[PDB]
Amino acid sequence: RPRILLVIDDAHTDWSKYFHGKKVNGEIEIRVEQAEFSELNLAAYVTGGCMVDMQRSFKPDFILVRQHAYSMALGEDYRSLVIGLQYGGLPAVNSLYSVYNFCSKPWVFSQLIKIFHSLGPEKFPLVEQTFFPNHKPMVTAPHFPVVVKLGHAHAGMGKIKVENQLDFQDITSVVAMAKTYATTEAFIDSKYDIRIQKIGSNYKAYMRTSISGNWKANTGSAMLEQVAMTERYRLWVDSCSEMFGGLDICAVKAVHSKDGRDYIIEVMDSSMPLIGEHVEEDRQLMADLVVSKMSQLP
């Protein structure tokens, strides 16, 4: 019988095309199921595995997670589906263990702080961010302008450049109303984003400039240019890939000031956006990695 791969993704792409001809241990056919989280439900059993309902029912053998499991500004919460697939004992890329731990940005950021403490600010320039568990301790910032980031949200949501204290005070009331946590960090007058990605043993670096006048350079029209990988960029991404027992797919993003300094602001996992000119190549590297992992199982 074919091994069933479930690709969980919201991207407008047909994942089966990247698996054409690929067989587990060069022997067993791979059936590719594809759905976004909102289309999936399951029961999971101590005795072993998951029965998945896609709206059709099936027991998956392997998961590829391409979609964010938690997106607070969209009102989407699939963390319990992640719990279920892990309860079923499913092997996955990235590991369901890491995917679950990635469902809170400040929790992930706490791992970046460990890297920072170990490597130092010259090797790993992490942005000097502050974390507030709720609105109450938020009074001011040491440096304006400041970037305030609410909760666990993506694609620029929940994020504001605050210019002054009066404005900061009014934003803290929004943190209160949202009943969530928040972080603050210096706004960097940045020329472009830098993102270093790792897919298995493939590395790429890109610079990204907003061509729509956006300080959130990952929103709206952007110009993307692939740049040379350096050993400095490689240490960033390799260091990040070590967390939560290991990340098969990940990326680290920095902002690059007009003064020449980089500041690491974020890390991403197997649900990272695919950017630049090699998106089709990147999905094929992901499919290659998945088949290799499937073949390493009994």
Ligand X SMILES: Nc1ncnc2c1ncn2[C@@H]1O[C@H](COP(=O)(O)OP(=O)(O)NP(=O)(O)O)[C@@H](O)[C@H]1O
Binding residues for a second copy, per CB under 8 A? Answer: 41-48, 51, 53, 72-75, 80-81, 83-84, 86-89, 100-101, 104, 106-107, 109-110, 113-114, 116-117, 126-137, 148, 150-151, 153, 156-161, 167, 170-171, 173-181
Query: Does 252 participate in binding ligand X (rule CB under 6 A)?
Result: no
Which does residue 44 bind out of ligand X, a second copy, Cl ion, none, counting CB within 5 to 8 angstroms by kind? a second copy
Distance of CA 94 to the CA centre of its chain: 10
Say how far apart CA 268 and CA 251 lie, in whole Å: 5
Q: Are 233 and 207 in contact, with CB atoms under 8 Å apart?
A: no
Interaction mask 150-169, Cl ion, x per CB under 5 A: ---xx--x------------
| CB closer to ligand X out of 248 and 266 | 266
Query: Does 205 participate in binding ligand X (rule CB under 6 A)?
Result: no
- The contacts of residue 105 (CB under 8 Å, 6+ apart) are 149, 152, 183, 266
Structure tokens at 55: 């709206």
- The contacts of residue 209 (CB under 8 Å, 6+ apart) are 191, 192, 193, 217, 222, 223
Q: Are 25 and 55 in contact, with CB atoms under 8 Å apart?
A: no
- The contacts of residue 14 (CB under 8 Å, 6+ apart) are 34
Q: Which of 95, 101, 190, 241 binds ligand X (CB under 6 A)?
A: 190
Cβ of residue 263: shortest distance to ligand X, in angstroms?
7
Query: Does 127 participate in binding ligand X (rule CB under 6 A)?
Result: yes
Query: Does 94 participate in binding ligand X (rule CB under 6 A)?
Result: no
Query: Does 9 participate in binding ligand X (rule CB under 6 A)?
Result: no
In eight-state DSSP terms, residue 167 is H
How wide is the angle at C-alpha 35 spanned by C-alphas 30 and 39, nearest 5°? 140
Q: Which of 81, 93, 147, 254 binds ligand X (CB under 6 A)?
A: 147
Q: Are 162 and 168 in contact, with CB atoms under 8 Å apart?
A: yes
Query: Does 154 participate in binding ligand X (rule CB under 6 A)?
Result: yes
Q: Which of 16, 104, 111, 218 binds ligand X (CB under 6 A)?
A: 218
Cβ of residue 14: shortest distance to Cl ion, in angstroms?
25
| CB closer to ligand X out of 18 and 192 | 192
